[PDB]
Amino acid sequence: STDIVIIGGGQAALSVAYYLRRSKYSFVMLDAEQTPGGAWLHGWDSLRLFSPSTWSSLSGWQMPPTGETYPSRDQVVDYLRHYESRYEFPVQRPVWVSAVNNLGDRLEVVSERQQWRARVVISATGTWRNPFIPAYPGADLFQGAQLHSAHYQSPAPFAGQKVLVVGGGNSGAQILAEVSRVADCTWVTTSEPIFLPDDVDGRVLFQRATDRWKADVVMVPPVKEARERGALHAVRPFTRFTANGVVWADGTGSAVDAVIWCTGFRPALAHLQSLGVINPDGKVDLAGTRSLQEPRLWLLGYGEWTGLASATLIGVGRSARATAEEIIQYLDS
Amino acid sequence: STDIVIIGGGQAALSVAYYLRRSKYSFVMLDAEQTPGGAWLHGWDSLRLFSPSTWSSLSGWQMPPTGETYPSRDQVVDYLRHYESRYEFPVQRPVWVSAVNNLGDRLEVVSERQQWRARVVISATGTWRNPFIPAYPGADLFQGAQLHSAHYQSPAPFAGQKVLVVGGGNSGAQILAEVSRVADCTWVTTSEPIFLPDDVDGRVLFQRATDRWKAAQEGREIEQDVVMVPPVKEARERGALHAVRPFTRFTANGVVWADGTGSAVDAVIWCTGFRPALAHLQSLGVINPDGKVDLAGTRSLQEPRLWLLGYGEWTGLASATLIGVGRSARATAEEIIQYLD
Amino acid sequence: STDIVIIGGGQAALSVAYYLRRSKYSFVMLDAEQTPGGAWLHGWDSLRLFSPSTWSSLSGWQMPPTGETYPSRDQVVDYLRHYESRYEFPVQRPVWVSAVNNLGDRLEVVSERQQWRARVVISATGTWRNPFIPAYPGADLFQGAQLHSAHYQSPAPFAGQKVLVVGGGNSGAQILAEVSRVADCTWVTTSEPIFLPDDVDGRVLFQRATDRWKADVVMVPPVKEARERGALHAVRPFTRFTANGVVWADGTGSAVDAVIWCTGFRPALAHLQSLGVINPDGKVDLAGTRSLQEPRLWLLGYGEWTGLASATLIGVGRSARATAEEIIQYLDS
Amino acid sequence: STDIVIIGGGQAALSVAYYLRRSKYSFVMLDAEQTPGGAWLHGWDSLRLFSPSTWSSLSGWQMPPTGETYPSRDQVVDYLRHYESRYEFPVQRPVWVSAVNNLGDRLEVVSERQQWRARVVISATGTWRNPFIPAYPGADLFQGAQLHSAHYQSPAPFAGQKVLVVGGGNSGAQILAEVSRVADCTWVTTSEPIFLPDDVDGRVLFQRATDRWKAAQEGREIEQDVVMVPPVKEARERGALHAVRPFTRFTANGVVWADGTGSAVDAVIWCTGFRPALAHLQSLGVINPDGKVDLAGTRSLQEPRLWLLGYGEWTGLASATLIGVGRSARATAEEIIQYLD
């Protein structure tokens, strides 16, 4: 029976925890992973961030520099691990929160073995656990291998395969870049993908949304190398799957052994279905981070819908600070 | 490492289990509840079915008869309890399945303490755990009590309250009927609610969809409501089933209607229904934009080792009813035995 | 060679014309119809507005009252006719504007027989001429009659037919109500339709957006009568057409002789394609009424995207006044 | 009241007309231009094709040869003029078709002064009249000159200017090549542009899509750029084909790039291409959300008395080219003669 339950223990949770720990109110953080790390523990082997440590730091404690390379997955995990420990956050892991229940004057946060009664709940569960794969005509038929980027690890199993990498943006480009080295790939995208200039990192992502808060594909090394191997040519979605291929709009067929779906993610709010707050679009209605339908619930770190850049290391701090503030207001009054 | 994992242990799971247990293939059933009973364990005190035991029976073993008329919640729980035990289904409870993962040639069904590798997964998790409450302007402001029908228990806490019962169909009518006796209620509905004739039960629900399933099967063309259970009939006689149309917004302690007038509201009981409770399938990527899965019959198009059973009209006409879930449950079992053979 | 060309001569054009005519600057209005009236000239026979004349008036001159009935189509046409004449707007009709061309320091507004050089263009062409019919699998096959609400006139040709009325909101309900009297109808809608209370008119539409600017189906008589004949039951979209029917999700077939598509309209900006300003969504990017890409172009009266309630008689005046203001500013400076 | 109305009178219209004129059925061609020529009448002064006359010929009558290499705009206009006249196509010009209306058993094709009742409509209106300019933050502010390639004529007005040529592919490269000589240009492109080898013309465009049409026909599986025309080659030699990536926003007299640096820009030539010019089909309700029509081949699914020809890859591989439009034009004629028979 604590004041604030933070569901999830990734960078967003950590961020809001940084801003609450000095306050009066109790909190616990529940996270589904074995160790610290958030979704980063499930990045592919070669995954690196698209901006340096300085543009990939949570509030307070900057990510330690990395030597001549954008931060690696393990390095991000490390930093979250150390960050969590540095500020001595009380995180219970592994814990799967199945539901958040309105018991009247407390919310109940429920897992298999334990429940927590709370005055406030912050849902910071990210997106990784809710990957999106669009349904195409023929999916029933397609015998070949299918793997969402969430679960992409290494290009080895795709060695020699006819592979479709599906979905634009950074994951598709980074995965294509890697898998095109060992397999014959086609990048399928809904729109012609748009690249940043070679000399700017994903900082420009943060910065664009700082301009918008004052009111596109990063050319990371592998992706740059893939341009040089003439492998970033994208095409438009196919019309349907066949048993071992796809048919494109022009009526032609192609063989496909494997599709890597880099089609992104939805907010992983399963644990909020019990609250009735999940809107038709699979999100929650918010003002800022705050649930309109349930104002003791805050949602943090999910995407543009919870705050410009909130689903980034550098960016999640604005809305995390503001969430902490609004929550401290709520609980004072 | 079994052949079929049935996620959930409500009447739908039971139904498909009845049809697989005689086969060669292994299965286990995982269910979230403490005991047998499915969502029925969470019905309100006075909840009764809208059709007799004969029209509320799973395959094989009929529900034992009940007096005067209509089976009670406990009686339905009882029958599921006994049904499960009668056919000796191996159900692990309580188990919360958090995700279904594609490991290549097995699906992994995952809970906190245990995982199961399976050749086939049947998701029969119902809707109760995914109640729907529509957002209205002002929900942020509304200080008064809010309770979805999922959690409605008894009218006692609403004693004397100004209550909105929101949402038509059977739950709203049955809850209104009960809560109007002790509180001042307004039934708010998107459309004028439509009542069945007083002398027909929810059997007509089943029957309509049998006509429509005779139609789809045979190939013929066809075309295209509140049961008057006792309490609901009584509520008509107390002139209490007058419904009005949605308000425009909440205020801190009321709602403002379209005409601009305000009303005080202490409590809103949302009888606005439920979505399919497929949280455990988000990990599979199969959840479509409408929060469902794309199916042919019960079968997942995107993931054909996954079947979905018992959720609603979208998994089969009448599949989300005791009597009705058996068609699609038999056909799921058949299709699954085909797949594995 | 005038200062302002107003393309289109419906209520939106009229509205902005009311606000410019007292100013210094010249303007002409070009409209495609034979007579005054805008899209109203193409309403079905029984079409009436969903709110009284007082809640269906343009600026200045109120619509004359109507006796115990919401204003009729002819009455709206009449009022536009008289309104246009009352303020002596110079409207050239019939004139089809095919394109708006950037000639440097003038825009050129082009029709077959005439061109106009202008400092400013206001596009107030409404939506009627750009009806939307969604494509369903099987449309190629469907032999039966098809008619968008734009062209619906009377229920007589549907006499005895198996009819699908497709699309919710007011047109579907009003057309269903009428056609269900003489044909066997199914109302197909993407979502369960939501009715206003019986004693409130489409004024509540205006009012909702006045609340939002300070910051759903009207039960018109026929539609009320149709509820009483138990005919407003809606169902969800079918999955596909067959040659003489549709197949629903449950796999069942139904015979359909006729589909009336009440699936609405897009903005009728064909004449702006030449300007390059039509965004991917088939609209123009705006601040208020003003084209971002082409700031001598204003768009008025189209929908929520040009202004809350701007596509209504009562509502179009806010954004029409503001357009006139912004245009008078532009041309002074 | 004719059988077939062909809307538009460019090379696509001509092509399908070649294939219908020997048939029994009447047709008329309506075209918006003052003279024959299609969009070619609006090409820039120095515009030449990217492949020789032999690879730029419509069906039947080949384009007459040209010296040194590559047919000029006037030469293409000429050939369309003569082609139209040679086969005596009845083309009404200038006629702007504003809408195509379904009157039941005829389609009505409408212009200001005249209407035509038709059993079949072929929309062959190209893309030129629907140029695309993407919106960037700051477009409201940008005071400097803006000109889509559609209207580019000559580099003279850009003399000495700081110019952005926006958009890759052939137009941007050809316009840059010309304007870089007289102005200070930056080529802005979404991706690094890719050049064909110096010794191959836009024939390779046709040929790629013949391989792909041999593939679709025969049923085999297959898989899935700037021609180095003379001026463009010259521009490489002047080191002027260096492209950069889109800027982030316009300012009043410049752009700000991603790195945060600013540049002055007097003029932007948008070589960002074209959409299908189907305005006259909005009235039919057939325009899909992507601004196209749903087709099987050339044929409208929603309105099967409507065919669309010559627009791009979506109406047929290479159909928006002189050499390429003939496959789909023959097949359209065939399908239309079938329909009417």
Ligand SMILES: Cc1cc2nc3c(=O)[nH]c(=O)nc-3n(C[C@H](O)[C@H](O)[C@H](O)COP(=O)(O)OP(=O)(O)OC[C@H]3O[C@@H](n4cnc5c(N)ncnc54)[C@H](O)[C@@H]3O)c2cc1C
């Ligand atoms: C492929 C990829 C590349 C990216 N690259 C970058 C980059 O270069 N720079 C950048 O700034 N951002 C990047 N991001 C974005 C973002 O920083 C990561 O997505 C990060 O995972 C977001 O952290 P989070 O805390 O919002 O979500 P997560 O890291 O997912 O944290 C949520 C935590 O909550 C847990 N959880 C979920 N549900 C429950 C439950 N019911 N009960 C208990 N725990 C639960 C999860 O297991 C997880 O441990 C990238 C994202 C992806 C997918």
Ligand SMILES: Cc1cc2nc3c(=O)[nH]c(=O)nc-3n(C[C@H](O)[C@H](O)[C@H](O)COP(=O)(O)OP(=O)(O)OC[C@H]3O[C@@H](n4cnc5c(N)ncnc54)[C@H](O)[C@@H]3O)c2cc1C
């Ligand atoms: C108010 C109301 C009245 C109704 N009245 C009738 C009636 O009169 N007659 C009739 O025939 N039908 C009626 N129904 C419909 C239907 O019979 C019930 O909804 C019933 O619960 C459907 O059974 P099910 O097995 O499909 O779903 P459920 O009964 O919910 O069973 C699914 C089981 O799966 C479990 N589960 C969910 N998620 C997980 C997970 N991740 N891991 C493990 N287990 C999980 C649930 O806890 C539950 O135990 C009614 C429904 C409602 C809401």
Ligand SMILES: Cc1cc2nc3c(=O)[nH]c(=O)nc-3n(C[C@H](O)[C@H](O)[C@H](O)COP(=O)(O)OP(=O)(O)OC[C@H]3O[C@@H](n4cnc5c(N)ncnc54)[C@H](O)[C@@H]3O)c2cc1C
């Ligand atoms: C079925 C229906 C019912 C409605 N009911 C109501 C109601 O009850 N109350 C209410 O307030 N609103 C109602 N509306 C909304 C709105 O008031 C009407 O749509 C009205 O038509 C909008 O007027 P407008 O001037 O924006 O558009 P329009 O009336 O279409 O005016 C545009 C004019 O521009 C012309 N035009 C188009 N393109 C060109 C071109 N290229 N060159 C020259 N001229 C051109 C058109 O022919 C037309 O004459 C309704 C709309 C519909 C469709």
Ligand SMILES: Cc1cc2nc3c(=O)[nH]c(=O)nc-3n(C[C@H](O)[C@H](O)[C@H](O)COP(=O)(O)OP(=O)(O)OC[C@H]3O[C@@H](n4cnc5c(N)ncnc54)[C@H](O)[C@@H]3O)c2cc1C
């Ligand atoms: C810069 C550029 C370079 C190109 N170079 C080559 C090349 O080298 N080789 C090659 O093979 N192809 C080339 N193309 C492609 C193609 O040959 C041209 O686009 C050509 O115009 C396509 O012919 P069309 O008949 O399909 O379209 P169009 O030539 O535009 O003809 C359509 C006709 O219909 C008319 N029209 C439009 N709307 C209406 C209406 N509502 N009513 C009546 N008439 C209407 C138009 O005015 C036009 O006269 C090029 C295209 C561009 C833009």
